[PDB]
Amino acid sequence: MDIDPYKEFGATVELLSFLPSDFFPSVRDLLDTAAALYRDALESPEHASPHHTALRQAILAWGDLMTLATWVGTNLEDPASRDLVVSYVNTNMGLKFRQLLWFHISALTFGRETVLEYLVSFGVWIRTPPAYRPPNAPILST
Amino acid sequence: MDIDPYKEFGATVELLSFLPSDFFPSVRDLLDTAAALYRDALESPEHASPHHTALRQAILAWGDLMTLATWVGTNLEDPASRDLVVSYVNTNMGLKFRQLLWFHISALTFGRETVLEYLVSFGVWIRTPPAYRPPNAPILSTL
Amino acid sequence: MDIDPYKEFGATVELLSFLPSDFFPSVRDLLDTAAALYRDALESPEHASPHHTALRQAILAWGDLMTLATWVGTNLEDPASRDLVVSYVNTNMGLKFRQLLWFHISALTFGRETVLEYLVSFGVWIRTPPAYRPPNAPILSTL
Amino acid sequence: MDIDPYKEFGATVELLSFLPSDFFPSVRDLLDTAAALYRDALESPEHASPHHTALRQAILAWGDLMTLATWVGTNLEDPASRDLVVSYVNTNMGLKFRQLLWFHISALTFGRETVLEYLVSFGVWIRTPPAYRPPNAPILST
Amino acid sequence: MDIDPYKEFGATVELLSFLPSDFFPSVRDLLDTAAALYRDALESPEHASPHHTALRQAILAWGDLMTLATWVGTNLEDPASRDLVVSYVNTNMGLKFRQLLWFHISALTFGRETVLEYLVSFGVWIRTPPAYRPPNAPILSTL
Amino acid sequence: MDIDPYKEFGATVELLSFLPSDFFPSVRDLLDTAAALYRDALESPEHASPHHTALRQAILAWGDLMTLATWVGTNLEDPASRDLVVSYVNTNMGLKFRQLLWFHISALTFGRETVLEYLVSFGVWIRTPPAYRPPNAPILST
Numbered sequence: 001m002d003i004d005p006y007k008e009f010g011a012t013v014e015l016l017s018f019l020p021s022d023f024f025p026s027v028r029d030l031l032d033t034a035a036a037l038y039r040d041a042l043e044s045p046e047h048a049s050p051h052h053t054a055l056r057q058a059i060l061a062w063g064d065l066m067t068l069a070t071w072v073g074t075n076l077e078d079p080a081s082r083d084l085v086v087s088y089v090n091t092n093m094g095l096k097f098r099q100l101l102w103f104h105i106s107a108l109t110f111g112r113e114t115v116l117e118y119l120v121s122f123g124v125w126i127r128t129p130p131a132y133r134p135p136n137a138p139i140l141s142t
Numbered sequence: 143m144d145i146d147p148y149k150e151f152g153a154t155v156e157l158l159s160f161l162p163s164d165f166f167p168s169v170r171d172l173l174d175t176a177a178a179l180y181r182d183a184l185e186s187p188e189h190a191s192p193h194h195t196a197l198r199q200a201i202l203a204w205g206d207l208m209t210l211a212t213w214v215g216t217n218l219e220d221p222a223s224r225d226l227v228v229s230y231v232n233t234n235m236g237l238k239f240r241q242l243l244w245f246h247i248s249a250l251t252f253g254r255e256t257v258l259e260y261l262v263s264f265g266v267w268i269r270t271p272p273a274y275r276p277p278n279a280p281i282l283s284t285l
Numbered sequence: 286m287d288i289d290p291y292k293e294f295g296a297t298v299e300l301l302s303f304l305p306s307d308f309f310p311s312v313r314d315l316l317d318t319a320a321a322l323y324r325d326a327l328e329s330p331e332h333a334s335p336h337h338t339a340l341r342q343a344i345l346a347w348g349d350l351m352t353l354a355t356w357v358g359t360n361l362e363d364p365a366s367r368d369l370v371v372s373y374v375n376t377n378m379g380l381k382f383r384q385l386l387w388f389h390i391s392a393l394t395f396g397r398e399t400v401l402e403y404l405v406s407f408g409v410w411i412r413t414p415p416a417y418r419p420p421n422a423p424i425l426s427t428l
Numbered sequence: 429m430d431i432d433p434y435k436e437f438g439a440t441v442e443l444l445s446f447l448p449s450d451f452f453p454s455v456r457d458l459l460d461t462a463a464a465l466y467r468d469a470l471e472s473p474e475h476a477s478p479h480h481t482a483l484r485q486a487i488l489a490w491g492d493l494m495t496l497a498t499w500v501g502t503n504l505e506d507p508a509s510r511d512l513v514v515s516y517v518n519t520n521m522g523l524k525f526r527q528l529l530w531f532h533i534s535a536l537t538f539g540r541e542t543v544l545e546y547l548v549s550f551g552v553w554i555r556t557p558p559a560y561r562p563p564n565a566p567i568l569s570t
Numbered sequence: 571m572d573i574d575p576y577k578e579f580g581a582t583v584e585l586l587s588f589l590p591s592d593f594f595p596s597v598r599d600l601l602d603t604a605a606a607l608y609r610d611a612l613e614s615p616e617h618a619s620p621h622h623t624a625l626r627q628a629i630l631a632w633g634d635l636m637t638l639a640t641w642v643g644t645n646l647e648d649p650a651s652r653d654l655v656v657s658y659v660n661t662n663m664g665l666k667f668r669q670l671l672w673f674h675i676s677a678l679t680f681g682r683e684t685v686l687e688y689l690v691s692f693g694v695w696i697r698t699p700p701a702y703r704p705p706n707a708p709i710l711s712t713l
Numbered sequence: 714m715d716i717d718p719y720k721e722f723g724a725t726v727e728l729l730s731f732l733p734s735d736f737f738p739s740v741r742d743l744l745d746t747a748a749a750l751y752r753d754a755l756e757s758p759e760h761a762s763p764h765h766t767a768l769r770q771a772i773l774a775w776g777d778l779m780t781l782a783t784w785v786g787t788n789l790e791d792p793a794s795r796d797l798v799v800s801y802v803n804t805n806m807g808l809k810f811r812q813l814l815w816f817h818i819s820a821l822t823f824g825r826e827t828v829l830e831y832l833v834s835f836g837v838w839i840r841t842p843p844a845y846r847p848p849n850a851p852i853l854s855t
């Protein structure tokens with residue numbers, strides 16, 4: 001079966017390819033902003049929203065990957081094939097957990113309809129020719 | 143943060159830990175079951191429940207992990223080291239995903255309440271020493 | 286003064302002496318169960334029941350015994366001369382705690398009367414010669 | 429599993445520590461108190477209150493500590509011992525079982541509220557410069 | 571600007587100055603008292619009063635000062651000079667904080683009115699020469 | 714006890730770590746802007762708000778620190794350990810009294826809800842990757 005992480009939220013993996021893969025801030029910055037003012041709500045015993053739910057399942061699925069990145073560093077004796085794994089997890093796999101972490105946190109902050117309009121408005125700027133492309137990128141705010 | 147992926151659904155991971163590793167069925171059976179009787183809803187653009195939502199995020203997160211073991215096979219060289227990683231994903235985290243994949247799917251066909259009532263009732267079964275322990279474990283009916 | 290901790294709950298110590306001392310699960314399994322099902326109620330500012338109160342004062346009694354049971358190692362220079370310290374109280378005395386932790390937890394999950402009828406029922410089961418009756422045993426559950 | 433045995437009784441462990449440790453009477457005193465005014469009430473088969481319940485469990489928990497302080501001593505002879513053993517029991521948790529055995533015994537004979545009103549009413553009286561305070565202590569009435 | 575931290579609460583610092591230095595109890599007792607019977611409200615996200623708000627800003631500002639005397643101990647070298655700073659914080663500003671810490675805490679357990687009525691009534695006591703002065707100072711009751 | 718200066722105002726010390734420590738204008742600029750159009754209200758005999766109250770207690774607690782910075786300069790004979798103190802007070806301790814002074818004055822100027830939204834909107838810009846990070850930072854205004 002072909003599940004899309006963003007389908008139920010009115011988005012799609014298509015629409016998020018609009019954003020360049022070198023947008024989405026670091027996983028550090030994301031998780032930090034999560035525990036900023038959602039720390040309480042995330043540890044709450046009640047699913048505040050479908051957004052909150054996915055954010056929890058994403059944060060933990062990432063946590064499983066940091067437990068993997070540690071066990072690999074302390075059980076793989078060959079450091080040529082040990083640092084080939086601890087790189088892929090913190091780089092390539094981290095990208096999917098950056099899009100997901102951005103999307104859900106941005107929604108809890110600004111609103112899912114505001115986010116979906118941002119994804120579209122960005123796809124006008126990013127696809128606007130460099131000559132007329134305005135100096136400032138569109139940024140989510142209030 | 144300290145996030146229990148079961149706190150939402152009236153459960154805890156401590157309650158889910160009592161289950162022995164030989165309890166949950168294979169990840170292949172866990173995904174064959176999911177697609178067999180929830181696919182239409184899982185691929186749907188409707189947040190059918192908090193249960194469904196978390197199931198998707200789990201099925202996907204695991205699909206991420208099988209992309210890792212596919213990459214490790216054809217990018218990691220040392221055959222004794224690439225089968226140390228491939229055996230960790232396939233086993234140690236696999237149980238964590240078998241615990242979660244089972245839970246959300248179970249509560250979909252029996253309800254969160256009937257499931258939690260089981261976990262408790264099973265908890266007191268396995269906690270009973272084998273001598274006084276009833277011959278067969280309690281089994282989950284729709285009741 | 287002879288205070289029976291089970292008296293106010295419709296039972297006696299003479300009764301829980303019936304379930305053969307190796308029937309009650311391990312203290313950790315007990316405590317985990319208390320965390321899994323009653324943690325929130327145990328940290329509440331409301332005396333949820335006479336059961337909750339006694340169990341709070343019991344987990345903390347053993348919380349005064351871990352700490353003291355289970356003690357000597359960070360303060361006793363002498364590692365040995367404890368053949369039946371040791372332990373021992375964690376065997377011939379730290380069994381009272383397992384009885385209480387079971388009784389109160391079981392009653393909070395199944396009901397005071399349900400447990401008092403199970404105390405009796407299972408009591409007559411094990412008291413049979415290991416003979417004809419039966420294969421299965423009485424067990425607290427949700428049938 | 430952070431359990432405060434005073435929380436259900438509208439108090440905290442911090443508030444009991446607010447009183448000086450030379451305040452709560454000896455355990456031999458406290459145990460003689462219950463058997464004096466409540467012996468019938470405690471050996472009673474109905475939980476007269478949450479206090480009666482907690483106090484019964486406390487007296488037995490202490491009885492298990494004078495059973496341990498006796499069995500450490502009744503094969504040994506190396507130091508005392510009764511050295512770093514039957515002193516610690518009768519020093520550190522001894523204070524705790526003086527604090528607890530008092531609190532509950534008091535509320536039965538005074539009133540849950542009057543007890544808490546007093547714990548504060550004392551506690552700070554002793555924390556008051558002598559030149560400007562009542563001659564002797566403030567003392568529980570009702 | 572000229573801000574009197576007492577002008578808000580119907581008082582003045584001149585009225586608060588009449589109190590001799592031996593009057594307010596120690597800063598350690600002033601913080602032990604605060605946490606003993608206001609902590610739940612002090613840590614609360616509710617501006618319980620203007621009194622509470624100012625108390626927090628004072629308890630914190632003092633916690634800042636004990637971070638200064640902790641830093642001065644292990645960063646200032648000259649032992650005769652680092653004990654000149656440590657003695658200033660612990661004494662001269664400490665009295666200012668004992669004046670303020672006492673005031674807001676006092677008005678919390680007796681009301682702003684009963685407190686201000688005292689400060690006046692005490693003001694006329696201490697202002698009386700010892701010969702004609704009543705033997706014991708007036709003491710603050712809940713009245 | 715663990716008091717948070719910002720908890721009651723709907724904020725938290727977490728949320729203010731969003732802002733880089735080299736934001737918050739000088740203490741001079743802060744106190745000057747305070748006496749600009751709040752001079753009257755701050756010296757008023759009535760607590761205009763909980764914000765006004767904390768601002769008063771913060772300005773004075775700072776004033777105590779400038780009395781300390783002076784007494785140190787004229788009673789510490791050793792100028793190696795005298796200028797080690799008058800630096801820490803005007804630098805490290807001054808930072809906490811800059812966040813506090815900014816936060817409360819900004820609220821009295823723009824509104825506590827507007828400020829809390831600024832702290833969030835800033836935490837999007839500051840955490841937005843330098844490549845797409847728009848030339849102008851979000852600034853509080855009207």
Ligand SMILES: C#CC(O)(C#C)C1CCN(CC2=C(C(=O)OC)[C@H](c3ccc(F)cc3Cl)N=C(c3ccccn3)N2)CC1
Pocket residue numbers: 165167171172173175176243244247248249251281282283284
């Ligand atoms: C009447 C009757 C039966 O007794 C029969 C036959 C019932 C027993 C429960 N069964 C279903 C079941 C699970 C589930 O929901 O299935 C969709 C789930 C499950 C969930 C997902 C999977 F992939 C596989 C399973 Cl195994 N779990 C369990 C389970 C696990 C351990 C012990 C007993 N039952 N079973 C079938 C009906």
Ligand SMILES: C#CC(O)(C#C)C1CCN(CC2=C(C(=O)OC)[C@H](c3ccc(F)cc3Cl)N=C(c3ccccn3)N2)CC1
Pocket residue numbers: 405406407408409410412413417418
């Ligand atoms: C719930 C229920 C029930 O009460 C119901 C319905 C069951 C409960 C368990 N019972 C076992 C049983 C006896 C008894 O309920 O002992 C507690 C009694 C018994 C009675 C007195 C004793 F001292 C010991 C026993 Cl062993 N007798 C036997 C027995 C007789 C013949 C062969 C083997 N076992 N078994 C059967 C009934």
Ligand SMILES: C#CC(O)(C#C)C1CCN(CC2=C(C(=O)OC)[C@H](c3ccc(F)cc3Cl)N=C(c3ccccn3)N2)CC1
Pocket residue numbers: 549552553555556560561562565566593595599600601603604671672675676677679709710711712
């Ligand atoms: C009846 C009667 C009593 O007379 C008795 C006993 C009352 C006298 C006031 N007492 C309390 C008190 C202060 C306060 O509010 O306590 C929380 C406050 C106080 C406030 C904060 C502290 F940390 C310590 C104190 Cl000390 N101040 C004072 C104080 C200061 C000087 C002279 C007399 N009383 N006392 C107790 C009741």
